[PDB]
Design an enzyme around this catalytic site. Structure first.
Site, short mmCIF file in Angstrom:
data_model
loop_
_atom_site.label_atom_id
_atom_site.label_comp_id
_atom_site.label_asym_id
_atom_site.label_seq_id
_atom_site.Cartn_x
_atom_site.Cartn_y
_atom_site.Cartn_z
N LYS A 35 43.61 94.71 66.53
CA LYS A 35 43.36 93.27 66.54
C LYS A 35 42.18 92.91 65.65
N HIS A 77 37.73 96.35 86.50
CA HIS A 77 37.85 96.46 85.05
C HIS A 77 38.93 95.53 84.52
N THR A 90 42.68 97.72 70.58
CA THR A 90 41.61 96.76 70.33
C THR A 90 41.18 96.79 68.87
N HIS A 123 23.46 85.51 89.70
CA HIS A 123 23.61 85.41 88.26
C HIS A 123 24.90 86.08 87.81
N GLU A 132 39.37 92.72 85.47
CA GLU A 132 38.69 91.44 85.41
C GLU A 132 38.00 91.25 84.06
N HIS A 174 35.94 104.83 85.08
CA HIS A 174 34.79 105.12 84.24
C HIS A 174 33.55 104.39 84.73
N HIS A 175 33.69 103.57 85.77
CA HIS A 175 32.58 103.01 86.51
C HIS A 175 32.08 103.93 87.61
N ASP A 230 54.01 68.53 80.42
CA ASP A 230 52.91 68.78 81.34
C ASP A 230 53.09 70.15 81.99
N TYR A 289 38.81 92.54 81.31
CA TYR A 289 39.86 92.34 80.33
C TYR A 289 40.55 91.00 80.53
N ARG A 313 18.54 99.49 85.86
CA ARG A 313 18.96 98.13 86.12
C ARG A 313 18.51 97.68 87.50
N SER A 337 42.37 80.36 94.13
CA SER A 337 42.54 79.51 92.96
C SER A 337 43.04 80.31 91.77
N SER A 338 42.50 81.52 91.57
CA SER A 338 42.90 82.32 90.43
C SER A 338 44.38 82.69 90.50
N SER A 397 42.42 84.02 67.43
CA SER A 397 43.59 84.08 66.58
C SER A 397 43.98 82.70 66.07
N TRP A 407 26.33 92.18 92.18
CA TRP A 407 27.59 91.46 92.11
C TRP A 407 28.77 92.34 92.50
C1 HEA Z 1 34.41 90.92 78.54
C2 HEA Z 1 33.78 91.90 79.16
C3 HEA Z 1 33.96 93.32 78.78
C4 HEA Z 1 34.79 93.96 77.78
C5 HEA Z 1 35.76 93.54 76.71
C6 HEA Z 1 34.48 95.40 77.94
C7 HEA Z 1 35.09 96.34 77.15
C8 HEA Z 1 34.88 97.68 77.24
N1 HEA Z 1 34.03 98.28 78.13
FE1 HEA Z 1 32.90 97.40 79.50
N2 HEA Z 1 31.79 96.53 80.88
C9 HEA Z 1 31.69 95.20 81.15
C10 HEA Z 1 32.37 94.21 80.49
C11 HEA Z 1 33.24 94.43 79.46
N3 HEA Z 1 33.59 95.64 78.94
C12 HEA Z 1 30.75 94.93 82.26
C13 HEA Z 1 30.47 93.52 82.74
C14 HEA Z 1 30.25 96.21 82.69
C15 HEA Z 1 29.24 96.49 83.78
C16 HEA Z 1 29.77 96.17 85.16
C17 HEA Z 1 28.70 96.53 86.15
O1 HEA Z 1 28.37 97.73 86.26
O2 HEA Z 1 28.16 95.63 86.81
C18 HEA Z 1 30.95 97.13 81.77
C19 HEA Z 1 30.73 98.47 81.86
C20 HEA Z 1 31.33 99.41 81.08
C21 HEA Z 1 31.01 100.84 81.28
C22 HEA Z 1 30.07 101.53 82.23
C23 HEA Z 1 30.48 101.38 83.68
C24 HEA Z 1 29.37 101.98 84.50
O3 HEA Z 1 29.32 103.22 84.61
O4 HEA Z 1 28.55 101.21 85.03
C25 HEA Z 1 31.83 101.45 80.27
C26 HEA Z 1 31.94 102.91 80.00
O5 HEA Z 1 32.73 103.34 79.18
C27 HEA Z 1 32.55 100.37 79.57
C28 HEA Z 1 33.43 100.60 78.55
C29 HEA Z 1 34.10 99.62 77.89
C30 HEA Z 1 35.03 99.94 76.79
C31 HEA Z 1 35.27 101.36 76.36
C32 HEA Z 1 35.56 98.68 76.35
C33 HEA Z 1 36.54 98.39 75.26
O6 HEA Z 1 37.45 97.33 75.54
C34 HEA Z 1 35.82 98.12 73.94
C35 HEA Z 1 36.75 98.43 72.77
C36 HEA Z 1 36.25 97.80 71.49
C37 HEA Z 1 35.78 98.50 70.45
C38 HEA Z 1 35.69 99.99 70.45
C39 HEA Z 1 35.31 97.75 69.23
C40 HEA Z 1 36.51 97.25 68.44
C41 HEA Z 1 37.25 98.41 67.79
C42 HEA Z 1 36.91 98.87 66.58
C43 HEA Z 1 35.76 98.27 65.82
C44 HEA Z 1 37.65 100.01 65.92
C45 HEA Z 1 37.97 101.19 66.84
C46 HEA Z 1 36.71 101.78 67.43
C47 HEA Z 1 36.66 103.04 67.90
C48 HEA Z 1 37.85 103.96 67.86
C49 HEA Z 1 35.38 103.56 68.48
N4 HEA Z 1 32.22 99.16 80.08
C1 HEA Z 2 29.23 85.45 81.88
C2 HEA Z 2 28.34 86.27 82.40
C3 HEA Z 2 26.91 86.28 82.01
C4 HEA Z 2 26.13 85.46 81.11
C5 HEA Z 2 26.35 84.27 80.21
C6 HEA Z 2 24.77 86.05 81.20
C7 HEA Z 2 23.72 85.54 80.48
C8 HEA Z 2 22.45 86.04 80.52
N1 HEA Z 2 22.03 87.10 81.27
FE1 HEA Z 2 23.12 88.19 82.50
N2 HEA Z 2 24.21 89.28 83.73
C9 HEA Z 2 25.53 89.13 84.00
C10 HEA Z 2 26.35 88.20 83.46
C11 HEA Z 2 25.96 87.26 82.56
N3 HEA Z 2 24.70 87.10 82.06
C12 HEA Z 2 26.02 90.14 84.97
C13 HEA Z 2 27.45 90.17 85.43
C14 HEA Z 2 24.87 90.94 85.30
C15 HEA Z 2 24.80 92.10 86.26
C16 HEA Z 2 24.41 91.53 87.62
C17 HEA Z 2 23.82 92.60 88.50
O1 HEA Z 2 22.79 93.19 88.11
O2 HEA Z 2 24.38 92.86 89.58
C18 HEA Z 2 23.81 90.33 84.48
C19 HEA Z 2 22.55 90.84 84.53
C20 HEA Z 2 21.51 90.34 83.81
C21 HEA Z 2 20.18 90.98 83.95
C22 HEA Z 2 19.74 92.16 84.78
C23 HEA Z 2 19.18 91.76 86.13
C24 HEA Z 2 18.59 93.00 86.75
O3 HEA Z 2 19.27 94.04 86.76
O4 HEA Z 2 17.44 92.94 87.23
C25 HEA Z 2 19.40 90.17 83.05
C26 HEA Z 2 17.96 90.36 82.75
O5 HEA Z 2 17.40 89.70 81.90
C27 HEA Z 2 20.29 89.15 82.46
C28 HEA Z 2 19.88 88.21 81.56
C29 HEA Z 2 20.71 87.26 81.02
C30 HEA Z 2 20.20 86.26 80.05
C31 HEA Z 2 18.76 86.27 79.63
C32 HEA Z 2 21.35 85.46 79.71
C33 HEA Z 2 21.56 84.29 78.83
O6 HEA Z 2 20.39 83.46 78.87
C34 HEA Z 2 21.84 84.71 77.40
C35 HEA Z 2 21.85 83.52 76.45
C36 HEA Z 2 22.64 82.39 77.08
C37 HEA Z 2 22.20 81.13 77.13
C38 HEA Z 2 20.88 80.72 76.55
C39 HEA Z 2 23.06 80.09 77.80
C40 HEA Z 2 24.28 79.78 76.94
C41 HEA Z 2 25.23 78.92 77.74
C42 HEA Z 2 26.12 79.44 78.60
C43 HEA Z 2 26.22 80.92 78.83
C44 HEA Z 2 27.03 78.52 79.36
C45 HEA Z 2 28.11 77.96 78.44
C46 HEA Z 2 29.12 77.22 79.28
C47 HEA Z 2 30.23 76.69 78.74
C48 HEA Z 2 30.52 76.84 77.27
C49 HEA Z 2 31.19 75.96 79.62
N4 HEA Z 2 21.55 89.29 82.95
O1 LIG Z 3 34.28 97.08 82.54
O2 LIG Z 3 34.26 97.53 81.16
CU LIG Z 4 35.29 98.98 83.09
#
Ligand code: HEA
Ligand code: HEA
Ligand SMILES: [O-][O-]
Ligand SMILES: [Cu+2]
Ligand SMILES: CCCCCCCCCCCCCCCCCC(=O)OC[C@H](COP(=O)([O-])OCC(O)COP(=O)([O-])OC[C@@H](COC(=O)CCCCCCCCCCCCCCCCC)OC(=O)CCCCCCCCCCCCCCCCC)OC(=O)CCCCCCCCCCCCCCCCC
Ligand SMILES: CCCCCCCCCCCCCCCCCC(=O)OC[C@H](COP(=O)([O-])OCC(O)COP(=O)([O-])OC[C@@H](COC(=O)CCCCCCCCCCCCCCCCC)OC(=O)CCCCCCCCCCCCCCCCC)OC(=O)CCCCCCCCCCCCCCCCC
Ligand SMILES: CCCCCCCCCCCCCCCCCC(=O)OC[C@H](COP(=O)([O-])OCC(O)COP(=O)([O-])OC[C@@H](COC(=O)CCCCCCCCCCCCCCCCC)OC(=O)CCCCCCCCCCCCCCCCC)OC(=O)CCCCCCCCCCCCCCCCC
Ligand SMILES: CCCCCCCCCCCCCCCCCC(=O)OC[C@H](COP(=O)([O-])OCC(O)COP(=O)([O-])OC[C@@H](COC(=O)CCCCCCCCCCCCCCCCC)OC(=O)CCCCCCCCCCCCCCCCC)OC(=O)CCCCCCCCCCCCCCCCC
Ligand SMILES: CCCCCCCCCCCCCCCCCC(=O)OC[C@H](COP(=O)([O-])OCC(O)COP(=O)([O-])OC[C@@H](COC(=O)CCCCCCCCCCCCCCCCC)OC(=O)CCCCCCCCCCCCCCCCC)OC(=O)CCCCCCCCCCCCCCCCC
Ligand code: CUA
Ligand SMILES: [K+]
Ligand SMILES: [Mg+2]
Ligand SMILES: [Zn+2]
Ligand SMILES: [Zn+2]
Lengths: 90, 459, 107, 47, 91, 123, 65, 98, 65, 49, 121
Positions: free
Chosen positions: B306, B228, B303, B60, B230, B277-278, B90, B232, B428, B152-153, B243, B125
């Site tokens: 924006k 991380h 952030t 997943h 990734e 921070h992970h 193109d 971003y 989790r 590919s990426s 935008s 994952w």
């Molecule tokens: C698109 C995906 C995405 C994005 C954008 C982000 C964005 C951010 N993530 Fe996230 N992050 C994940 C995907 C993402 N993350 C995933 C997938 C994990 C779990 C991975 C795993 O463990 O499997 C994770 C995990 C994760 C962790 C925990 C890691 C761990 O211990 O397991 C933390 C801890 O700080 C973190 C922080 C942040 C922060 C600080 C941002 C910042 O970019 C957010 C900044 C945005 C705001 C703050 C809001 C907008 C700003 C304002 C409204 C005004 C200013 C606000 C303040 C000054 C507070 N992320």
């Molecule tokens: C893009 C990434 C992505 C997306 C869409 C989702 C979507 C969802 N995920 Fe998540 N999820 C992850 C990434 C994502 N997840 C990751 C990275 C983890 C951590 C893995 C790990 O534990 O190691 C995780 C873990 C995770 C867990 C924890 C598993 C565990 O620890 O035991 C659960 C539990 O309910 C969950 C639930 C869901 C549900 C209910 C939805 C969705 O059903 C929410 C609603 C969405 C829909 C109803 C579908 C909408 C359509 C699309 C998303 C496709 C659209 C396609 C195009 C537009 C081309 N997710």
């Molecule tokens: O990874 O936030």
């Molecule tokens: Cu991170």
């Protein structure tokens, strides 16, 4: 400049900010030095900052302290309210 | 022809089509999870078959990130409009563009075939060793997919960077988002390939990097150094789409264009140096933790700029224009949702708070609000904006207020309880749980089944 | 920042006392899905689609000049749906400057 | 000590060590700031 | 439901011939949507979802009456002693 | 230009159909998941097991701060807990009359032995 | 990962790292926790239970066991 | 009676003065009347700075005055905690093997 | 040629054969089966049942069904 | 100017949680000192099963 | 205040009412809204006001509902969402009677503060 809108910098210091490219470089350099200085001058220095007998007491501290000292609040606040675990059951 | 086509616009469609197809498997895997977590005790997975659940969560996560969202936002929309946003005809490297989509498909087939043929076990994952290197051959197959996906990426990143050479117009904000994402891939992918090879070496070449006297934490540093960037890389293309949509649908020039561009650049620079921070709970040095915590908070500054620039784009727009279009609603919904996800990210950035919230469903909800809602909705919003240009039909999504409202309500039902569960606390990657967490898990499960039903209404 | 074109007071003086801003409608009309004819084959449906392009439409002002469909980005300038080959002739991005050379003029 | 049904426990619950209290207080300290950030931004999401 | 004619703060500005155009109505009509029973059903509906979202489903309480009573007895007889208003809460 | 299902839905006012759909979708989701557990009666949700957990909590003084904080909050103002009014497990529909009689006999015996031990401890 | 939420401890049990965590328990009780790092088939089935008792009670318990 | 006097006083004091434009624009030619129409995109009706402050200031007083009203009338203070007495703990843990 | 002006002209001009859409949906359906079929197969392999009965791994009342 | 309303609205709502936290800290200081819920010489080791 | 102190070249309406007009409307029917405030069939053009006569820049405002129902219509003639009401009628009233606006805003703020504080406390 620090925490300064650069439009103010452009207006009040035209000659200094005449070369914008150079101005941008100074902005980066100045803030780079600050970050570098904080680590090695505020965080790093060993065996310093432990003089807890010299806590800073600002004028606001003394104003509130004297106000409570004049009344009994300061004495009441510092008094230990409870020093026993169980209450006596009648 | 169908496979021999080099037209970038055709290839862009293929990326979108393939992501939807793979999305179904990802949705199925997601649906399996919430059904199991409906209540304590086994529901659809035997206790003797708990290994399958570990594979479900592992796939997943992998499929959704590398095979669904990344191709959709970085391969699908960019390949369609990026050469159009540029004044060029193109894509620069047409043949490379063709092989990139084919590579993605072959890696997908390898992954799903491994489910069918290999024993089903999971390691998350993130593939943390030593668990990843003591597993069965399914782990070997998944590594091949990731390495193949990496090819590919990187070649796609090379393709977009070449637009700078040939662009005959202005570099719009959207073009900047794709370019900077390519830069992140170029610098982060080779590090990922190196560490993945070490995982293969231990699995397949009797290497001893991940046994005693070999620091297992070494993997976490190299992996998250790519991990991380990734996240971003996933979101930055979404920022570009928002935008364009907000400016176009409001007839307002993008405010602070250069501030937007510099914010994207700043995020990438900061995003490349905050990976640890992970790794808060592993026991890093005091000064190391303070550094990463301090720099992680700084990412909010660019952030935030924006976010505010987006808000002023919507403010003051003409009232006569109908505001119920699905693309506009999704773009506005993104701002509301992203703020929730980002704020919770800042909360878990504080390492002492993170001690309690690491490996809990609070982290799950954090990245679902950003990715499962925000990124998906941004991808949906972009596709809807380009409906006339793309030309697809046979769906009712352009003006469908029911779909937008129901989607927003139900996805929030899935993931808001997961924040609460995080403090309760529920770990989790867990199948069973204590009886006193059932209420919140039950509510989220009802949310999951509801969302799937809504998708059937678009057709 | 951009705040519109600069205007001088003399430029606002009308030549008649009854001048008011022209009330020309910039709503291009009522549209929906492009509706093809069953009799038209693939080639003639393509012609039909090419004749329904909003970006080929404009509004004619009272002096004969037309304000065309305009967009912030060139994505809205290709035919919808996008054809295989879009920009056969390179789109021109017109910049303005005050520089001039004598060869362009004649006395 | 142990999870209890239908509990928000926002920021944590039932600390037993001085460090556990610190974790809860830190979250509560920042929680009002988070609300301010959300409310101030969301209020301006409009035409 | 043949709604009434609300003349308004200035009755002179509603004194003309409306023809087929609709005539202004009391504000209660807007909140009831002209007493549309389905707006009232969709209204009763609105309050149910809201209640579930903030307080949970209290429509399951009649079925939970007997099993809640047993839980209350267990807390009082064997659970940790409650004090004051704390006796009102059972986990 | 649309099928019957959309022509029917799109005809009604949005705020008439929308609230009904939200409730309907949620109800269907709950019903669908309840199909697979009709009549399932785990012993750990019986009254006898519930009482035993209360005994364990009293002995272990579980969550004393939440109980203290709940009392303090209630004294000050209106305090409402979902746990107080709502079932904590989904099998409550079928377990109205369910009991574990083996546990009842064992728990009663242990309580009797405890009373003897308490008297001996009092001495 | 050894997690006891009530004691404010969540420390990864990594091979090759003997991490040090200090605590000071203020009240008696039994504090439950679960492994917080995916570790295989039965990651969900290795809970952590710590019971804190009075020092006099602990001394008697330690001597007997 | 008093309400009318105070209403008139505030009305007179709040009448806006012409704005001090922060943008470079020309002077409209003298004698130029209405040139646009009501079908132009609506321009939001904004309060003048004085009125905005008075209205905004009143709301701030209201919201915090209401907060004090609730805390002093609707809510109650915690009574002292019940006295703590020495109680007998249970003789055995319920799961202690016999 | 006019027929070649638009990419995917048959689909865009609404003349395509419906089988193309069916294959796309079928391909998606097959992708979904890769999560369900191995679940059933693995459950039977290690337990002898395609799907468990709810809470069958825990103690159940006598009348439970 | 209108954005200031959001700032004031955010400050007020944020201040509500400040007051809740303020009362929470007062309550915690009284738990170990006065609260009868706090008990000592109470929990006894269960022993191995 | 755009018409009052900023711009003198847009038509300035008369306030018919500082409250919205409630009316039942039908989908598929076009309605014409008075933008001058002098029509006697408010909130609709009566055929004798400035809007009907196209005088002084006043024109009828076309409007059409998507669904049948009861809708609120601007009476102040300056609501941003005109013809529909969004609260601009109250805002424009406060400009004319700021003392009254303070009383209402204080009362509304007082209620909001009490309820929010009472529930959270
Ligand atoms: C698109 C995906 C995405 C994005 C954008 C982000 C964005 C951010 N993530 Fe996230 N992050 C994940 C995907 C993402 N993350 C995933 C997938 C994990 C779990 C991975 C795993 O463990 O499997 C994770 C995990 C994760 C962790 C925990 C890691 C761990 O211990 O397991 C933390 C801890 O700080 C973190 C922080 C942040 C922060 C600080 C941002 C910042 O970019 C957010 C900044 C945005 C705001 C703050 C809001 C907008 C700003 C304002 C409204 C005004 C200013 C606000 C303040 C000054 C507070 N992320
Ligand atoms: C893009 C990434 C992505 C997306 C869409 C989702 C979507 C969802 N995920 Fe998540 N999820 C992850 C990434 C994502 N997840 C990751 C990275 C983890 C951590 C893995 C790990 O534990 O190691 C995780 C873990 C995770 C867990 C924890 C598993 C565990 O620890 O035991 C659960 C539990 O309910 C969950 C639930 C869901 C549900 C209910 C939805 C969705 O059903 C929410 C609603 C969405 C829909 C109803 C579908 C909408 C359509 C699309 C998303 C496709 C659209 C396609 C195009 C537009 C081309 N997710
Ligand atoms: O990874 O936030
Ligand atoms: Cu991170
Ligand atoms: C020194 C030593 C020397 C040793 C020597 C030894 C030599 C060894 C040789 C080794 C090499 C062998 C191979 C050589 C290849 C040669 C290529 C070449 O020149 O071809 C010219 C040749 C030209 O053909 P032609 O003779 O002119 O005739 C073509 C037609 O007339 C009409 O032209 P056309 O091109 O339009 O027609 C082709 C097309 C036309 O048909 C269509 O396109 C149908 C309409 C579309 C319907 C919707 C499809 C879904 C949407 C997909 C969106 C993304 C598309 C991405 C782009 C396409 C990617 C393939 O149909 C196909 O070919 C099949 C299309 C498949 C699309 C797949 C999309 C995703 C499917 C997702 C599945 C989900 C379920 C999961 C489970 C199953 C997993 C497999 O190419 C082709 O057109 C045919 C290519 C066929 C080979 C494909 C091989 C694929 C292998 C995949 C991996 C399988 C491994 C695992 C098996 C698992 C099974 C379960
Ligand atoms: C003590 C040590 C002292 C050492 C001293 C060393 C001195 C070195 C001097 C270097 C001087 C450079 C001179 C060339 C300037 C650039 C000109 C240029 O590119 O011409 C266009 C030229 C095309 O010719 P054209 O027809 O004139 O282009 C027309 C435009 O396309 C049409 O566009 P338009 O007309 O609309 O707009 C024009 C312009 C519009 O753009 C601009 O004008 C951008 C202007 C700013 C550029 C940055 C300047 C540096 C700023 C200060 C940074 C200081 C940091 C200090 C840190 C200290 C820490 C200790 O377009 C471009 O510039 C397009 C190219 C942009 C590429 C950006 C790639 C990402 C880099 C990051 C962005 C920069 C962020 C700076 C920091 C931001 C935060 C404050 O571009 C190319 O040839 C493209 C080649 C693409 C190759 C890609 C693959 C390269 C390998 C990648 C490896 C990994 C890279 C990792 C990067 C990480 C980034 C975060
Ligand atoms: C908890 C009760 C639950 C009741 C069940 C649910 C019933 C259904 C309600 C549906 C409401 C839909 C409203 C329209 C969407 C909103 C869009 C929008 O704002 O744009 C409009 C419009 C924008 O221009 P437009 O182009 O005309 O509109 C475009 C539409 O989006 C175009 O959308 P469209 O094409 O779909 O057309 C929609 C059209 C047609 O809309 C409709 O058909 C809706 C007509 C109103 C129905 C309201 C029924 C309320 C029943 C309450 C029952 C309470 C007792 C429950 C049991 C308690 C037991 C303890 O909307 C309008 O004409 C706009 C009217 C202005 C919004 C009015 C919303 C508030 C209504 C009053 C709520 C009162 C709640 C009291 C709760 C007390 C609890 C104890 O102006 C605004 O934005 C309006 C500003 C806000 C004004 C209302 C302020 C709130 C009301 C006072 C406070 C109430 C709470 C008191 C709590 C006290 C606790 C102790
Ligand atoms: C995330 C979900 C929600 C998303 C919501 C948001 C969506 C927003 C909108 C997004 C829109 C994106 C942009 C769209 C642009 C579309 C452009 C377009 O249409 O291009 C034209 C393109 C082709 O049109 P064309 O130009 O006329 O092409 C002519 C052909 O090239 C030439 O014609 P031909 O007739 O010569 O064709 C050759 C044909 C020859 O045809 C035939 O001979 C057909 C014979 C009948 C076969 C039928 C299947 C039989 C299956 C039997 C199963 C038995 C099971 C037994 C089980 C027993 C159990 C006990 O095929 C072949 O020869 C090769 C076929 C290979 C591909 C198909 C593979 C199928 C799966 C295979 C699985 C294998 C598994 C093995 C595993 C083993 C493991 C060990 O259209 C398509 O390909 C169809 C696209 C349809 C979708 C369009 C978009 C609509 C909007 C979205 C709708 C929602 C979709 C949701 C996903 C699906 C859910 C399931
Ligand atoms: C007098 C009334 C009361 C006053 C109180 C005063 C308080 C101090 C503030 C400063 C003083 C203000 C005085 C203003 C005087 C007037 C000045 C002026 O120029 O007037 C004319 C000026 C413009 O006049 P105009 O141009 O003629 O147009 C007038 C029109 O009516 C157009 O008007 P508009 O466009 O300005 O409409 C404003 C509307 C515009 O707003 C929007 O457009 C919003 C659009 C996005 C909506 C997003 C919805 C939420 C999404 C949630 C995501 C998750 C979904 C989960 C789903 C689950 C499944 C269902 O704003 C709102 O709706 C308010 C949004 C506020 C943030 C909402 C989030 C609250 C979160 C709180 C923390 C939660 C923690 C939870 C902890 C656990 C549980 C307790 O109007 C105003 O200034 C009106 C201001 C009125 C604002 C009242 C907002 C009250 C909201 C209260 C929220 C309470 C939350 C309770 C929970 C707290 C927990 C901690
Ligand atoms: Cu050990 Cu998980
Ligand atoms: K389960
Ligand atoms: Mg971990
Ligand atoms: Zn009129
Ligand atoms: Zn009005």
């Amino acid at each position: 400049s620090i925490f300064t809108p650069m439009d103010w910098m452009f207006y009040y210091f035209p000659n200094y900010s005449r070369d914008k490219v150079a101005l941008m470089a100074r902005q980066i350099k100045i803030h780079f030095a600050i970050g570098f200085a904080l680590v090695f001058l505020v965080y790093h220095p060993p065996y310093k900052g432990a003089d807890y007998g010299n806590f800073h007491k600002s004028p606001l501290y003394w104003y509130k302290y004297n106000q409570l000292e004049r009344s009994g609040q300061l004495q009441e606040n510092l008094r230990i309210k409870r020093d026993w675990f169980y209450d006596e059951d009648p | 022809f169908y496979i021999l086509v080099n037209n970038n616009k055709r290839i862009g469609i293929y990326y979108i089509k393939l992501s939807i197809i793979i999305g179904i498997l990802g949705i199925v895997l997601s649906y399996i999870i919430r059904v199991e977590l409906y209540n304590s005790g086994n529901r659809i997975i035997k206790y003797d078959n708990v290994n399958y659940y570990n594979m479900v969560i592992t796939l997943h996560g992998l499929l959704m990130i590398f095979y669904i969202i990344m191709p959709g936002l970085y391969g699908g929309i960019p390949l369609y409009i990026l050469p159009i946003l540029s004044v060029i005809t193109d894509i620069v490297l047409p043949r490379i563009n063709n092989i990139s989509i084919i590579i993605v498909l072959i890696s997908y087939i390898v992954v799903i075939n491994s489910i069918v043929i290999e024993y089903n076990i999971g390691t998350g994952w993130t593939l943390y060793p030593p668990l990843s290197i003591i597993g069965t051959v399914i782990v070997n197959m998944i590594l091949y997919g990731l390495i193949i996906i990496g090819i590919s990426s990187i070649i796609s990143a090379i393709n977009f960077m070449n637009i700078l050479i040939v662009i005959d117009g202005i570099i719009y904000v959207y073009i900047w988002s794709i370019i900077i994402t390519s830069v992140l891939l170029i610098i982060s992918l080779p590090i990922l390939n190196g560490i993945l090879l070490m995982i293969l070496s231990d699995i397949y070449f009797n290497s001893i990097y991940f046994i005693l006297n070999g620091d297992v934490v070494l993997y976490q540093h190299l992996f998250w150094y790519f991990g991380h960037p990734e996240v971003y890389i996933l979101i930055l293309p979404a920022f570009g789409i928002i935008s364009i949509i907000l400016s176009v649908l409001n007839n307002k020039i993008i405010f602070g264009m250069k501030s937007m561009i510099l914010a994207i650049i700043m995020i990438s620079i900061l995003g490349s140096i905050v990976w640890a921070h992970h790794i808060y709970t592993v026991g890093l040095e005091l000064d190391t933790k303070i550094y990463f915590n301090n720099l992680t908070l700084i990412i909010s500054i660019p952030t935030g700029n924006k976010i505010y620039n987006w808000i002023i784009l919507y403010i003051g727009s003409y009232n006569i224009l109908y505001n119920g279009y699905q693309s506009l609603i999704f773009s506005i919904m993104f701002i509301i949702i992203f703020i929730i996800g980002g704020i919770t990210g800042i909360i878990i950035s504080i390492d002492i708070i993170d001690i309690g919230l690491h490996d809990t469903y609070y982290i799950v909800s954090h990245f679902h609000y950003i990715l499962s809602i925000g990124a998906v909705i941004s991808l949906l919003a972009g596709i809807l904006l380009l409906k006339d240009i793309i030309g697809y039909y046979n769906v009712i999504i352009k003006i469908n207020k029911y779909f937008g409202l129901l989607l927003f309500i139900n996805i929030n039902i899935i993931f808001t309880p997961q924040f609460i569960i995080g403090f309760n606390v529920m770990p989790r990657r867990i199948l069973e749980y204590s009886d006193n967490i059932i209420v919140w898990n039950l509510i989220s499960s009802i949310g999951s089944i509801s969302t799937i039903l809504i998708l059937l209404s678009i057709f | 920042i951009y705040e519109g074109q600069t205007v001088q007071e003399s430029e606002l003086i009308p030549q008649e006392d009854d001048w008011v801003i022209e009330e020309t409608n910039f709503c291009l009309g009522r549209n929906c899905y492009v509706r093809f004819r069953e009799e038209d084959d693939l080639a003639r449906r393509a012609l039909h689609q090419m004749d329904s392009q909003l970006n080929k439409m404009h509004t004619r002002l009272r002096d004969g000049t037309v304000i065309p469909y305009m967009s912030f980005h060139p994505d809205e300038m290709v035919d919808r749906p996008a054809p295989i080959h879009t920009f056969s002739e390179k789109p021109l991005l017109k910049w303005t400057w005050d520089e001039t050379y004598e060869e362009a003029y004649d006395d | 000590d142990i999870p209890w049904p239908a509990r928000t426990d926002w920021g944590g619950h039932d600390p037993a060590t001085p460090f556990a209290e610190l974790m809860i207080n830190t979250h509560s300290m920042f929680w009002p700031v988070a609300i301010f950030i959300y409310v101030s931004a969301i209020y301006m999401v409009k035409k | 439901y043949t709604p009434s004619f609300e003349r308004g703060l200035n009755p002179e500005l509603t004194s003309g011939d409306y023809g087929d155009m609709p005539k202004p109505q009391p504000l209660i009509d807007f909140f009831t949507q002209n007493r549309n029973p389905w707006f009232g059903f969709a209204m009763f509906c609105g309050f149910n979802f809201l209640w579930w979202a903030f307080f949970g489903a209290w429509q399951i309480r009649p079925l939970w009456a007997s099993q809640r009573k047993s839980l209350a007895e267990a807390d009082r007889l064997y659970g940790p002693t409650k004090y004051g208003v704390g006796k009102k809460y059972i986990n | 230009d649309f099928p019957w299902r959309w022509g029917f839905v799109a005809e009604k006012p949005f705020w008439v159909g929308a609230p009904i759909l939200v409730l309907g979708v949620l109800c269907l989701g709950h019903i669908i998941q309840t199909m697979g557990q009709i009549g399932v009666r785990p012993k750990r949700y019986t009254p006898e097991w519930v009482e035993a957990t209360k005994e364990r909590e009293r002995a272990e003084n579980t969550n004393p701060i939440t109980r203290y904080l709940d009392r303090r909050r209630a004294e000050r103002g209106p305090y409402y807990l979902m746990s107080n009014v709502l079932p904590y497990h989904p099998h409550f529909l079928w377990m109205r009359n369910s009991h574990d009689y083996e546990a009842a006999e064992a728990l009663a015996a242990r309580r009797e032995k405890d009373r003897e031990l308490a008297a001996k401890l009092e001495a | 990962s050894w997690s006891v939420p009530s004691l404010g401890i969540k420390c990864d049990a990594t091979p090759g790292r003997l991490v040090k965590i200090n605590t000071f328990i203020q009240r008696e009780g039994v504090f439950y926790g679960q492994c917080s790092e995916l570790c295989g088939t039965l990651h969900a089935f290795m809970p952590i239970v710590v019971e804190a008792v009075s020092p006099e009670a602990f001394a008697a318990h330690a001597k007997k066991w | 009676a008093v309400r009318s006097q105070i209403e008139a006083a505030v009305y007179k004091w709040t009448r806006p003065r012409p704005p001090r434009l922060g943008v470079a624009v020309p002077r409209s030619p003298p004698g130029t009347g209405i040139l646009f129409h009501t079908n132009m995109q609506t321009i939001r009706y904004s309060l003048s700075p004085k009125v905005w402050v008075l209205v905004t200031g009143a709301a701030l007083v209201g919201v915090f005055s209401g907060q004090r009203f609730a805390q002093t009338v609707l809510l109650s203070k915690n009574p002292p905690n019940p006295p703590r007495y020495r109680e007998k703990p249970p003789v055995r843990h319920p799961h202690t093997p016999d | 040629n006019l027929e070649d002006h638009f990419d995917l002209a048959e689909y865009m001009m609404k003349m395509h054969n419906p089988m193309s859409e069916y294959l796309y949906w079928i391909a998606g359906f097959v992708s979904g089966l890769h999560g369900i079929l191995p679940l059933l197969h693995s459950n039977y392999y290690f337990s002898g049942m395609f799907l468990p009965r709810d809470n069958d791994n825990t103690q159940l009342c006598d009348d439970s069904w | 100017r209108d954005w200031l309303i959001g700032v004031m609205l955010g400050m007020y709502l944020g201040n509500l949680c400040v007051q809740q936290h303020r009362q929470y800290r007062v309550d915690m200081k009284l738990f170990y000192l006065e609260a009868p819920e706090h008990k000592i010489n109470w929990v006894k080791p269960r022993g191995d099963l | 205040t755009w018409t009052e102190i900023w711009w003198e070249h847009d038509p300035t309406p008369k306030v018919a009412q500082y409250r919205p007009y409630v009316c039942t409307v039908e989908s598929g029917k076009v309605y014409w809204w008075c933008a001058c405030g002098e029509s006697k069939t408010q909130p609709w053009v009566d055929g004798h006001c400035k809007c009907s006569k196209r005088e002084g820049g006043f024109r009828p405002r076309r409007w059409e509902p998507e669904h049948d129902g009861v809708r609120l219509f601007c009476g102040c003639k300056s609501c941003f969402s005109s013809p529909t009401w969004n609260g601009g009628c109250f805002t424009k009233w406060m400009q004319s009677n700021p003392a009254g606006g303070m009383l209402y805003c204080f009362a509304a703020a007082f209620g909001f503060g009490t309820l929010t504080v009472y529930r959270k406390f």
